[PDB]
Amino acid sequence: SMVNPTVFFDIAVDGEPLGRVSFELFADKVPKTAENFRALSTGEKGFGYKGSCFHRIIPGFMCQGGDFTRHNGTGGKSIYGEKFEDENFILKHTGPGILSMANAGPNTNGSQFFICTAKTEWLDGKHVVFGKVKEGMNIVEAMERFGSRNGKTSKKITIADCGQLE
């Protein structure tokens, strides 16, 4: 893209490299939310995603991660403070690869996010969609296999490294 940043996660399984997932961040349409994710991916504010876990992976639905503060699925922090408002609902959860914000109700975006592995239309208008997997959907599909019905993972799936491309 000429406008939208690309960021990457190097995914690990119990510390071993699984592969790289890259994301287009839709700064063109969802700028504040895209910028939060971009900055958390580079670590440039002094904190961010590197080292954090995909704590909830449910096959057929999504891979969720992004808690770098409590490290247990309850934490979250944005570059704007602990939470920020729902920016817009222009984009929908249309299929695999969609990148969207996790939340605890209206206007509670922090750092947790999820990657859809299927269309999740019941989340439209409730979770802010702000990007999509560019390359490495096969790696997301490999991650999905470590999940279970209640989201607990059979091995620890982490963001071993992350950053911005070009």
Partner: peptide, 9 residues
């Protein structure tokens, strides 16, 4: 004391 949010158990 730790909160582990439920999906289903």
């Amino acid at each position: 004391d730790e909160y582990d949010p439920t999906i289903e158990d």
